[PDB]
A = this chain, B = another copy of it.
Amino acid sequence: HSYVELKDKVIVPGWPTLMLEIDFVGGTSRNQFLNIPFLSVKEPLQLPREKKLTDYFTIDVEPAGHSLVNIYFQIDDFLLLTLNSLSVYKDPIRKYMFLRLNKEQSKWAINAAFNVFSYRLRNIGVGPLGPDIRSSGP
């Protein structure tokens, strides 16, 4: 297989957001969390409270330059189905993915030597013009 890029275009302004929050080992201050707008979704995600994220969603942080980091992903079939069914951009999710962070995003990941303590997905809702904005594409 290969690891396919999850590109920026899966973020569609005005649609609720799925956010991947990452905390690194030795992080003390919370403004050190790496928060990544991950996917725009038609409705918020809800996983079976029984199931854990760690069993359906593996992440891995690697260096990609002198101040860049990439995030690599393993996504279980059942979550890929769920995510593909929520995603506003049409079915962008594959089993093996990655996305590139910019230099600003990468600062704390480089400092913790890519050592991850905890991660999660969080549903982030929309602002006052959200419907208008998504309705307004050219």
Instruction: Show the binding face of A for B, using Cβ within 8 Å.
Output: 1-3, 6-9, 11, 13-14, 17, 19, 21, 23, 25-33, 35-38, 40, 43-52, 54, 58-68, 70, 72-74, 96, 98-107, 110-118, 120-133, 136-138
Contacts and interface: CB of A to CB of B under 8 A. Distances in A.
Contacts of A132: 25-26, 74, 96
Given A52-B117, A72-B13, A124-B31, A105 B67 contact: yes
Oligomer: number of copies = 12
Contact of A31 (B11, B105, B115): B115
29 contacts: A1-B136, A8-B64, A8-B68, A13-B98, A17-B114, A19-B110, A21-B43, A25-B47, A25-B52, A25-B120, A25-B121, A28-B30, A28-B117, A28-B124, A28-B128, A29-B33, A31-B123, A32-B125, A36-B110, A49-B115, A50-B118, A51-B118, A60-B128, A62-B126, A62-B130, A66-B101, A72-B127, A116-B127, A117-B131
Nearest to A117: B131
A30 B54 contact: yes
B63 A122 contact: no
Contacts of A28: 30-31, 54, 113, 117-118, 122-124, 128
